[PDB]
Each structure stands twice: as C-alpha cells, then as structure tokens.
Amino acid sequence: GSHENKQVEEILRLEKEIEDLQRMKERQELSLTEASLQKLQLEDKVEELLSKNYHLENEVARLKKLVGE
Amino acid sequence: GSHENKQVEEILRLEKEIEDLQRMKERQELSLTEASLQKLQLEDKVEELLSKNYHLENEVARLKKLVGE
C-alpha cells in the first residue's frame, strides 16, 4: 500500500462528493427551467378554459336571471 | 310534481356544473401563484448551495491541481 495512495484516494473522495454537489446545483437549475415551462402550459389550459367558461357563463348567467339571477 | 320543477331543476344543474368549472379556473390560477412562489424558494436554496459549492469548488479545485487538476 503506497503512501501516495492517500493523496490519490483523497482527491477521489473529493471528486465523488463534489460531483454529487455539482449535480445537485444543475438538477435544481433544471427544475426552475421546467417550472417556468410548466407555468406557461397552465396559461394555455387556463386561457382556453377561461374563454370557454366565459362563453358558458353568459349562457347560464342569462338563464339564471329567468329564475332569479 | 310541478312542471316548473323543470326550470328550477334545470338551473340547479347549471349551478352545480358551472360551480365545478368556476372552481377549476380558480384552482388553476392558485397553482400558478404557488408555482411562482415555489420557484423563488428554489432560488434561495440554489443561491446558498451555489455559493457554498463555489467556496468548496475553489478548495477542492486547488487540491485537484496538486494531483493533476
């Protein structure tokens, strides 16, 4: 068992640990990107549903008035 | 069974169905609000972790050079 193994082994540990942290930072950044994209997707769904809801809202709202709003 | 029940019953159905759609629109809007808030939370975690990672990055990076970068 060479003594230098300590230095080689020491760095090896740092690479493994650092690599883990590096991925954690990158993974989080990816989540933010996906989060933003997900939000836009909701806008599309909400936009269409909101528009449709409004159309029906007028239809039902009109009928509601007959009974008593 | 009064005939008018049809009108009363008709509106009742509309209120239940419309109410469901109304909540769906509001629920989605809430999701967007929470989504944005969640993103900021990630910034705080990433910001701190990123800063700490950088500090360690210099420490380990410096050591890596001794072995061979």
Side-chain angles (χ1 to χ4, degrees), chain B residues 25-56:
Chain B
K25 184 175 72 164
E26 293 176 359
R27 283 177 178 196
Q28 288 172 296
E29 289 175 0
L30 290 170
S31 181
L32 280 152
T33 297
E34 293 177 2
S36 182
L37 281 170
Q38 181 170 62
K39 288 173 72 167
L40 271 64
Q41 292 293 305
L42 271 71
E43 298 179 3
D44 181 353
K45 185 178 181 179
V46 170
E47 176 171 345
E48 295 293 339
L49 270 289
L50 177 159
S51 300
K52 292 179 181 179
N53 289 342
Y54 176 79
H55 182 63
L56 272 60

Side-chain angles (χ1 to χ4, degrees), chain A residues 8-67:
Chain A
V8 177
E9 287 172 0
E10 185 181 12
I11 269 66
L12 185 62
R13 291 181 291 178
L14 296 175
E15 291 177 4
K16 290 177 175 179
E17 189 71 9
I18 290 297
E19 180 176 12
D20 287 346
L21 272 61
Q22 287 290 310
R23 289 173 175 173
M24 283 175 65
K25 184 175 72 164
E26 292 176 359
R27 284 177 178 196
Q28 289 172 296
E29 289 174 0
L30 291 170
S31 182
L32 280 152
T33 297
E34 292 177 3
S36 181
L37 281 171
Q38 181 170 61
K39 287 173 72 168
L40 270 64
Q41 292 293 306
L42 271 71
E43 297 179 3
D44 181 354
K45 185 178 181 179
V46 170
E47 177 172 344
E48 295 292 339
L49 270 289
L50 177 158
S51 300
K52 292 180 180 179
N53 289 341
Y54 176 79
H55 182 63
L56 273 59
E57 182 174 12
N58 290 341
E59 293 291 350
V60 304
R62 183 179 295 277
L63 291 171
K64 263 75 184 301
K65 292 179 180 179
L66 281 57
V67 171

